[PDB]
Amino acid sequence: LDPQIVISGSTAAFLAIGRFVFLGYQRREANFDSTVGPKTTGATYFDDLQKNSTIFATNDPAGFNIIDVAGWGALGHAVGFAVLAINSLQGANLS
Amino acid sequence: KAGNWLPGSDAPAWLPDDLPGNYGFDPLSLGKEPASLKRFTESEVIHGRWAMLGVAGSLAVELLGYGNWYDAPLWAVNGGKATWFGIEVPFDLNALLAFEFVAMAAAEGQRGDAGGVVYPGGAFDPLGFAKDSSKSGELKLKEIKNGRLAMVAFLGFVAQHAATGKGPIAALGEHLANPWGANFATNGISVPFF
Amino acid sequence: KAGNWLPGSDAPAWLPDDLPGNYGFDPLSLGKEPASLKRFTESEVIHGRWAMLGVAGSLAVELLGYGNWYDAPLWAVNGGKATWFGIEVPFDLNALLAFEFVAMAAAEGQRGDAGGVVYPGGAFDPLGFAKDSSKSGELKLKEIKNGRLAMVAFLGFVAQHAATGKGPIAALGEHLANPWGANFATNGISVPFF
Amino acid sequence: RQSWLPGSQIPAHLDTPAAQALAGNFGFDPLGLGKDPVALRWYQQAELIHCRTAMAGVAGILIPGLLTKAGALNVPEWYDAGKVAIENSFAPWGSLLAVQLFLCGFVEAKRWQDIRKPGSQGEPGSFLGFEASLKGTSELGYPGGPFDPLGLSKEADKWADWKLKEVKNGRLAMLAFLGFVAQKYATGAGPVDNLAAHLKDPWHVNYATNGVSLPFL
Amino acid sequence: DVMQAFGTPEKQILIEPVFAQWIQAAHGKALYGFDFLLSSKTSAAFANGQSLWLPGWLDAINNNQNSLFLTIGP
Amino acid sequence: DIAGLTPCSESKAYAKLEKKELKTLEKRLKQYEADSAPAVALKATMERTKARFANYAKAGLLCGNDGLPHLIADPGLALKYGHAGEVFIPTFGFLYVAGYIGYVGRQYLIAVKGEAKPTDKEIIIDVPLATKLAWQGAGWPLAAVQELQRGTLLEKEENITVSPR
Ligand code: CHL
Ligand code: CLA
Ligand code: CLA
Ligand SMILES: CC(/C=C/C=C(C)/C=C/[C@@]12O[C@]1(C)C[C@@H](O)CC2(C)C)=C\C=C\C=C(C)\C=C\C=C(C)\C=C\[C@@]12O[C@]1(C)C[C@@H](O)CC2(C)C
Ligand SMILES: CC(/C=C/C=C(C)/C=C/[C@@]12O[C@]1(C)C[C@@H](O)CC2(C)C)=C\C=C\C=C(C)\C=C\C=C(C)\C=C\[C@@]12O[C@]1(C)C[C@@H](O)CC2(C)C
Ligand SMILES: CC(/C=C/C=C(C)/C=C/[C@@]12O[C@]1(C)C[C@@H](O)CC2(C)C)=C\C=C\C=C(C)\C=C\C=C(C)\C=C\[C@@]12O[C@]1(C)C[C@@H](O)CC2(C)C
Ligand SMILES: CC1=C(/C=C/C(C)=C/C=C/C(C)=C/C=C/C=C(C)/C=C/C=C(C)/C=C/C2=C(C)CCCC2(C)C)C(C)(C)CCC1
Ligand SMILES: CCCCCCCCCCCCO[C@H]1O[C@H](CO)[C@@H](O[C@H]2O[C@H](CO)[C@@H](O)[C@H](O)[C@H]2O)[C@H](O)[C@H]1O
Numbered sequence: 001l002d003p004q005i006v007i008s009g010s011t012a013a014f015l016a017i018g019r020f021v022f023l024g025y026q027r028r029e030a031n032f033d034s035t036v037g038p039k040t041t042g043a044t045y046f047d048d049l050q051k052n053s054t055i056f057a058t059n060d061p062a063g064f065n066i067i068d069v070a071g072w073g074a075l076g077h078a079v080g081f082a083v084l085a086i087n088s089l090q091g092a093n094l095s
Numbered sequence: 096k097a098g099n100w101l102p103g104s105d106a107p108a109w110l111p112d113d114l115p116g117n118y119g120f121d122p123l124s125l126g127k128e129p130a131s132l133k134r135f136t137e138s139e140v141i142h143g144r145w146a147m148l149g150v151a152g153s154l155a156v157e158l159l160g161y162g163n164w165y166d167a168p169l170w171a172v173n174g175g176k177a178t179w180f181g182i183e184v185p186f187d188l189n190a191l192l193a194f195e196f197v198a199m200a201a202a203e204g205q206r207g208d209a210g211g212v213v214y215p216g217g218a219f220d221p222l223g224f225a226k227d228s229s230k231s232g233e234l235k236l237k238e239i240k241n242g243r244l245a246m247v248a249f250l251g252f253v254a255q256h257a258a259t260g261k262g263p264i265a266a267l268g269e270h271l272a273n274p275w276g277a278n279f280a281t282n283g284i285s286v287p288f289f
Numbered sequence: 290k291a292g293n294w295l296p297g298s299d300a301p302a303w304l305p306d307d308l309p310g311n312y313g314f315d316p317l318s319l320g321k322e323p324a325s326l327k328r329f330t331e332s333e334v335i336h337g338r339w340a341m342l343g344v345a346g347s348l349a350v351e352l353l354g355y356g357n358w359y360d361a362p363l364w365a366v367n368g369g370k371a372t373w374f375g376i377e378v379p380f381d382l383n384a385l386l387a388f389e390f391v392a393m394a395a396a397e398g399q400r401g402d403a404g405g406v407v408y409p410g411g412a413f414d415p416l417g418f419a420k421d422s423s424k425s426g427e428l429k430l431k432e433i434k435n436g437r438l439a440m441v442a443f444l445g446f447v448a449q450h451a452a453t454g455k456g457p458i459a460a461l462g463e464h465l466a467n468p469w470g471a472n473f474a475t476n477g478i479s480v481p482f483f
Numbered sequence: 484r485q486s487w488l489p490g491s492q493i494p495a496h497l498d499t500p501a502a503q504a505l506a507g508n509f510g511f512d513p514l515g516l517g518k519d520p521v522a523l524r525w526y527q528q529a530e531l532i533h534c535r536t537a538m539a540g541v542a543g544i545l546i547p548g549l550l551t552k553a554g555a556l557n558v559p560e561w562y563d564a565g566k567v568a569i570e571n572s573f574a575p576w577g578s579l580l581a582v583q584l585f586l587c588g589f590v591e592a593k594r595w596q597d598i599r600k601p602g603s604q605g606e607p608g609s610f611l612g613f614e615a616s617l618k619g620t621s622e623l624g625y626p627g628g629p630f631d632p633l634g635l636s637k638e639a640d641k642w643a644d645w646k647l648k649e650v651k652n653g654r655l656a657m658l659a660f661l662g663f664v665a666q667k668y669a670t671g672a673g674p675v676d677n678l679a680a681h682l683k684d685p686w687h688v689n690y691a692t693n694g695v696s697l698p699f700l
Numbered sequence: 701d702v703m704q705a706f707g708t709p710e711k712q713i714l715i716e717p718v719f720a721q722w723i724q725a726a727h728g729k730a731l732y733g734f735d736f737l738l739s740s741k742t743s744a745a746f747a748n749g750q751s752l753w754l755p756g757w758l759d760a761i762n763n764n765q766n767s768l769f770l771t772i773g774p
Numbered sequence: 775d776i777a778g779l780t781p782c783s784e785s786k787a788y789a790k791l792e793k794k795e796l797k798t799l800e801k802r803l804k805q806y807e808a809d810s811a812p813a814v815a816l817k818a819t820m821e822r823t824k825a826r827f828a829n830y831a832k833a834g835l836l837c838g839n840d841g842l843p844h845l846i847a848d849p850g851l852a853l854k855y856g857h858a859g860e861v862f863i864p865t866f867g868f869l870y871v872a873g874y875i876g877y878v879g880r881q882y883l884i885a886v887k888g889e890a891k892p893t894d895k896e897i898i899i900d901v902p903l904a905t906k907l908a909w910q911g912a913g914w915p916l917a918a919v920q921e922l923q924r925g926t927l928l929e930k931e932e933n934i935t936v937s938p939r
Contacts, residue, residue, distance in 0.1 A: 001189075013197050021204040083189055102610070103596045103603025275574035280581035289577030317629045322615035329612060482555055514913040522920045707798070709842055710791060710830065715861070716844045718851060721777050732777045774844055 001087050003080075014018065014025030018072035019064050027063075097236055114233065116239035137213045143242020150245045153252055153263060163262030164252065258284040291430060309426070310433035327405060334407045335437020344439045347446055347457060357456030358446065452476040487511040496523065506643070507650035524623070528598060531624045534653020541656040544663060548675040560673045561663065598623065669695045714774035724769050730760045733772060775850060779836035779844055785843025792827045796820060833859070870915070877914035881907045 018026075039050045058065040089095065096106065098118045106112075107117035109127050114136070126132035139248075153164035161181070170177055177184035177191075206212070214235070216225055225231045252263050259266060259282060269277045279285045290298065292312050300313030303321045308330065320326035347358035355375065364371060371378040371385075380388075403409070408429070410419060419425040446457050453460055453476050463471045473479040486509050488492060493510035496502060496518050501576055505527055517523035523692075544561040551558045559567045569576050597604055597619055605618035617618050620627040620636070625646075636642065666677050680688045690696045703712040725734035737745045738754065746754065760768050775781060782788045799820050806813040834856065835843040845860040846852050852862045882904055886895035921927040 009193070013193065017197060017200050017204070021200055024208060025204070087189060099606065099609060101596065102593075102602050102606045102614070275578050278578060278581070280578040281575065286577065286581070289580070316632060316634065317616065319613070319616050319629070324607060325612040325615045514910050516913050516916055519924060520921055521924065707795065708826075710788075710827070712842070714838075714842060714844045715847055716777050716779070718777060718846065718848045734777075765775075773838060 001084055003084060006084050007077060007080035010080035011073055013074045014076035014079065015069070018068065019062060023062055023064065023068075026068075115235035118242070133211065137211050140213045140239065140242065143239060143246055146245035146249050147242055150248045150252070153249070157262050157264040163256075163265070165256055167263065180212075258282040291434075307426075309429035310437070331405050331407045334433065334436065336432060336440055340439040341436055342444050344442045344446075347443070351456050351458040357459070359456065360451055449473075452478045485509055494518070496520070506646035507654070527596070528624045530650070531653070533657055536651055537656040537660055541659045541663075546660070546675065548673060548699060552675050552679075562667055593617070597626075669693050716774060717772050724761075724772070727769060728745055728754070728761045729771075730762060730768055775834075775836055776846060776855060779838055781831075782835050782837035782841075782843055783831035785837040785841050786838045787839065788827075788831070789841075792823070795823055799823065835860070841922050873914050873918065874911045877918060878907050878911040881911070 042046045042048075056065040056067055096112050096117055096119065097115070098119040099106070100120040104119065106117075107121050107124065107126075108127070109124070109132065110117055110119060110121060116139075121127075126135055136198050151166075156167065161178075169175075171188040171191075177186060209215070214231075215227065215279075220226065225234055255261075255263065255266055258279070259269075259271065280289055285289075290306050290311050290313065291309075293300070294312040294314040298313070301315045301318070301321075303318075303323075304311055304313055304315060304324065310333075315321075319322070320329055350361060351357050353374075355372070365382040371380060400406070408419070408425075419428055449455075449457070449460055451474065453463075455463070460471075474483070484493070485621075488511075490594060491510070494512045494515065494517075496515075497508060497510050497512055499520075501520065502508060502517075502523065505523075517526060547556060547558040548561070550556040558564065569579075572579070593604055601623055602618045605614050607614065610617065616628045617626075618628070619625075625636070635645065663674050666672075669690065670677055670680075672680070691700070703709060721732045722734055722736065725732050725736040725739045728738035730739050737743050738749075738758065740746060749757075760766060764771065798818055798848040803813060803816045803820075808817070830843055835897055836838065836846070836857075838844050846855070847861045849862050852858045852860065882900075885903060885907070886892045918927075
């Protein structure tokens with residue numbers, strides 16, 4: 001199989017559904033983590049290491065920041081290589 | 096109440112009377128919690144609707160002479176090409192999974208966010224059969240009764256094939272040939288001691 | 290009341306006097322409940338009408354020499370072509386079942402939604418014999434008595450065929466030939482001994 | 484007060500008016516199985532079904548057996564009839580039994596629900612108009628209605644007498660079948676053949692000399 | 701022990717580990733003759749893995765000189 | 775056969791085992807007289823040994839490579855191949871007796887709890903009552919089940935003492 005089509009194709013699908021299908025659902029479940037509350041309430045260096053010091057703002061209308069791009073892109077790459085690797089096993093000698 | 100599954104019994108309290116297809120059948124009291132029953136009510140309709148499509152599809156394939164429901168995906172294994180009504184299809188297995196996963200995710204994800212809708216209507220009822228909303232009681236009862244019947248039938252397809260290995264239409268023909276000598280009591284599988 | 294089935298016996302209270310064909314015969318009290326009696330009153334007439342057509346058809350086939358009622362459908366299993374008055378009919382078993390099922394379902398479905406009408410009239414009474422109320426009373430009695438006789442007669446055909454393996458008209462001729470030699474006692478099945 | 488053993492103390496639970504209403508009450512309950520009133524109501528039904536089933540079965544072993552000896556019939560021994568019938572049969576015994584369990588299970592299930600809720604099978608609309616005649620009578624285990632075509636249960640004077648005859652013949656029939664089973668293993672012959680042997684030489688052909696029942700002797 | 705002391709080794713109670721021997725059959729040990737799953741050459745489980753690891757696995761499990769699923773008894 | 779076993783009647787090792795045991799007995803026999811007391815006892819032992827090996831073979835047991843009978847415990851395998859008498863049937867034989875003993879003791883213990891001094895009825899047994907309960911225990915499975923369905927088999931959680939938690 002052509003890696004460029006399969007890997008890019010799978011990544012596009014996983015980015016497309018993530019942006020257009022599961023974005024609303026994913027955000028709602030992320031607020032279920034708000035009900036419990038913040039991890040720590042302190043002002044020491046080690047307490048600062050547990051806070052969202054940097055907020056990743058995005059200009060995308062739906063709020064599809066880079067962290068979401070990395071998450072959904074990784075699933076597409078993972079699925080893409082699973083498809084390629086399995087299809088490679090066809091026509092393998094002594095393997 | 097649509098009837099009584101066990102004549103002379105008392106209907107469970109937690110099963111509301113107007114619920115479509117309510118025969119009072121809940122031996123294990125799985126629907127006792129109102130929140131759980133609400134989910135179960137939706138799942139039964141969705142399971143039944145898929146079963147109705149599946150049983151109709153499984154019978155249709157063999158009636159028209161295109162094989163049985165079990166052999167349909169063998170082309171993707173042996174190396175042949177897909178066919179629909181005898182018309183060759185240009186896709187392969189890995190391609191098919193792509194369209195289905197994306198397509199079904201969009202539809203099911205859109206349904207999921209509706210928060211438990213089971214009778215949408217509107218665009219899903221173009222002819223307006225249930226637009227009345229008052230006479231829909233019978234149609235909802237007819238849908239669930241055919242849905243439950245289809246779910247039982249499909250389990251028969253899977254169970255029968257695992258025992259005899261023949262398609263649903265072929266099995267029916269074999270029963271009619273020798274009703275007393277060809278049935279579940281003659282598999283050699285269903286009843287070990289027969 | 291038409292009469293008395295067992296002279297010197299009392300009539301059941303639950304059986305109305307004006308009900309056609311009322312002989313006060315209900316040993317098992319199956320019609321004691323009014324709801325049950327209403328359904329059975331319709332079913333007796335429906336059975337009677339079907340039996341009367343059935344008996345007439347069974348006798349007509351053998352009188353005209355086209356066979357007996359029993360072996361008419363053998364061509365399907367044996368393998369052959371249907372016949373009616375000796376003229377070939379192109380349909381086959383699969384075609385007959387489909388058309389019969391659809392036609393009977395539509396016709397019987399219409400009657401089912403009526404609610405239990407036994408004497409519709411109008412479209413079903415083109416000659417208007419039962420238009421007059423006074424005349425209808427006696428015609429209903431005549432219908433049921435002939436219908437009850439036809440129901441018994443058909444039971445005679447089936448039971449006699451099982452014992453003797455012959456058609457109704459063939460058996461009647463055999464009995465006339467040797468009345469004391471051919472009868473239920475002499476068929477070797479009806480009476481256990483001898 | 485007739486009792487199975489004169490001079491013995493009848494169990495208290497069998498002397499209650501409810502208990503004495505049962506047919507065939509001779510105070511026989513040494514193991515105290517009927518002490519609980521709810522249990523006794525259930526065991527009474529079990530006896531009636533065992534009684535009636537045993538009578539039908541014994542009649543089907545005995546009457547054909549005598550007529551076979553008389554030469555009016557040719558029926559194999561009750562312990563062989565199963566094999567003989569299945570040969571010239573339209574179905575194998577696996578299919579025949581499976582149908583038997585569906586039909587018996589359905590009919591038995593309705594009888595079961597009447598024990599739990601007497602008269603509950605006359606639920607309007609439950610059956611195709613036939614539920615009216617499935618209510619049974621005021622006495623559990625005596626359905627009547629369609630099961631009493633001749634209406635012999637409508638005579639109040641003869642009612643107690645009829646029930647006693649049924650239980651007496653039923654208990655005798657139950658013991659008869661236990662004798663058929665024990666006499667097949669003990670003697671290796673048919674029931675009527677065993678009777679013929681005993682009558683020929685009663686004092687030498689019995690269980691005391693069959694070489695099985697009394698191993699010590 | 702009493703049976704052995706009295707010289708009647710045939711009177712002792714030896715229960716076959718059928719449940720554990722049945723597991724070994726499912727993994728391909730053909731000694732017990734259960735012909736179950738990997739022990740049967742017609743099962744789907746046997747066929748699917750027949751090109752990846754079963755040839756090596758089945759060869760080792762049926763070698764009785766190694767400790768891979770030793771034969772078990774009473 | 776089952777699990778690689780073979781019927782003892784067809785087992786070579788099983789047959790050889792019988793000869794070894796009989797040979798040992800015969801060796802001791804030849805140091806006595808024909809009809810002396812020791813000789814008669816030894817001959818009686820040999821008869822029982824021969825009978826034992828015939829009975830086990832006749833019973834259709836399975837022998838391993840050791841040539842000793844092995845028992846089948848799975849109910850499905852036992853009923854499938856007629857080994858129900860090894861473990862399956864004796865299983866329900868023991869439970870009837872075990873329930874009999876336990877049920878009889880429980881009935882007696884309940885009976886004396888109503889007496890004025892239950893403790894003195896336990897060290898000093900009320901034999902007339904014990905014999906009465908001993909015979910009525912034959913129907914324990916019926917009585918045991920009916921207690922379970924009527925809900926009088928178990929105590930209430932609120933009437934049982936428990937430690938702090
Ligand atoms: C009352 C039930 C009943 C009894 C006692 C028998 C007994 C017998 N059948 Mg018969 N059958 C019975 C029902 C049926 N049989 C057959 C079909 C056959 C065949 C085809 C054959 C026999 C044969 C035989 C005889 C030889 C041994 C055998 O095959 O045993 C196996 C069967 C049994 C031992 C049945 C035992 C059933 C038992 C009453 C169950 C009770 C369970 C309850 C829960 C009660 C529990 C409490 C306890 C205390 C009883 C044996 C005398 C064979 C024969 O004639 O050989 C010469 C034979 O070939 N039977 C059918 C049709 C499906 C039956 C349906 O009910
Ligand atoms: C939807 C109902 C249905 C129907 C019409 C059939 C019909 C058939 N089955 Mg199938 N079957 C079904 C459900 C059904 N099955 C289910 C749910 C299972 C899983 C338990 C099986 C498991 C099964 C096996 C293992 C075998 C069959 C076989 C057969 C055939 C012979 C009869 C037999 O042994 O049935 C077996 C029937 C049952 C185990 C009980 C089914 C009870 C149904 C669901 C009751 C439905 C309600 C009502 C009482 C009847 C409505 C009828 C319907 C037409 C509307 C026949 C074509 C045999 C075959 O292929 O022979 C050649 C065969 O080997 N079936
Ligand atoms: C203690 C647990 C235990 C275990 C590990 C086994 C193990 C086994 N049993 Mg046994 N069995 C047990 C308890 C157990 N049984 C009990 C309590 C009963 C009821 C008294 C039975 C009744 C029984 C029957 C009737 C049969 C077996 C059989 C079997 C074998 C294969 C099926 C099986 O049970 O798979 C693993 C076990 C389990 C998951 C536990 C439940 C097992 C159920 C009760 C029986 C399943 C039978 C199966 C559907 C038969 C299909 C045909 C087979 C040839 C593949 C296997 C050696 C079958 C045999 O003889 O195969 C050669 C067989 O026919 N068992
Ligand atoms: C049996 C079933 C569910 C049964 C549930 C039961 C009995 C529950 C019973 C109870 O819980 C109650 C109610 C109440 C409790 O108190 C008691 C119990 C007893 C616990 C569902 C089946 C559900 C079945 C479903 C959804 C089937 C769907 C099938 C499809 C889509 C098939 C598609 C295809 O067949 C085609 C068309 C062509 C082929 O080539 C390819 C494929 C893909 C195979
Ligand atoms: C006998 C019968 C019913 C009898 C009922 C009885 C005695 C009931 C009695 C009691 O309930 C009462 C009243 C009151 C209770 O207190 C007591 C009892 C005792 C319980 C019905 C027959 C009913 C008979 C009917 C409906 C027959 C229909 C026949 C047809 C359609 C035949 C068609 C064909 O024959 C052709 C024409 C040509 C062939 O080639 C093909 C075929 C298909 C075979
Ligand atoms: C149902 C029954 C028999 C049914 C037989 C049938 C259907 C036979 C059918 C067939 O034969 C035919 C016709 C023809 C054959 O070709 C085929 C078969 C199929 C073989 C017997 C029950 C037989 C039942 C018996 C014997 C039960 C006995 C119970 C006793 C003695 C209990 C005593 C006590 O319990 C009390 C009452 C009170 C306590 O306090 C004390 C104790 C002592 C515990
Ligand atoms: C701007 C814009 C746009 C566009 C966009 C784009 C074009 C994007 C892209 C994106 C992308 C393109 C992304 C990507 C990502 C990726 C990633 C994130 C990856 C990851 C990976 C991984 C993680 C891997 C791993 C691994 C390895 C390493 C080895 C083997 C195994 C595995 C596979 C697992 C649009 C028009 C739409 C809209 C408007 C605006
Ligand atoms: C061969 C056939 C295989 C079929 C495999 C099916 C896999 C299903 C994976 C589902 C993954 C989760 O996705 C699904 O989560 C929730 C339902 O659980 C839905 O989301 C909704 O669910 C909650 C619970 O019902 C609702 O209260 C909320 O409105 C919302 O959170 C998502 O919109 C849906 O997409």
